[PDB]
């Protein structure tokens, strides 16, 4: 007590071009407490081979994590960042808009 709700931002490291190797990032920030589930998704399924930064926190003591995975976009493929946390009733899926990204 108290508890703060994760903010979820999804963006690519390089221009989203089908068939080109790229990196998908999910930056999850501003949450408390640290217990959290963050997963990168391809077509609904957790991406098993991902990287994440070690847990860190801001001056206000809220935590942040950076997730990233190498991925090759295609036209059919859908990418997302899913986050569960005590402040969240349902897991929250933020879908990766290829053109815009998904920031707040």
């Amino acid at each position: 007590a108290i508890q703060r709700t994760p903010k979820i931002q999804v963006y690519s490291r390089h221009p989203a071009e089908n068939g080109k190797s790229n990196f998908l990032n999910c930056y999850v920030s501003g949450f408390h407490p640290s217990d959290i589930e963050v997963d990168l998704l391809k077509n609904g399924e957790r991406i098993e081979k991902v990287e994440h930064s070690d847990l860190s926190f801001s001056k206000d003591w809220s935590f942040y994590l950076l997730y990233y995975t190498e991925f090759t976009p295609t036209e059919k493929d859908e990418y997302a960042c899913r986050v569960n946390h005590v402040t969240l009733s349902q897991p929250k899926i933020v879908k990766w808009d290829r053109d815009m990204g998904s920031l707040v």
Binding site: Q9, Y11, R13, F23, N25, E51, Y68, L103
Partner: peptide, 12 residues
Amino acid sequence: GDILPNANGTWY
């Protein structure tokens, strides 16, 4: 927007 982190020490 916000300046956001990339892996390997760069920003977005």
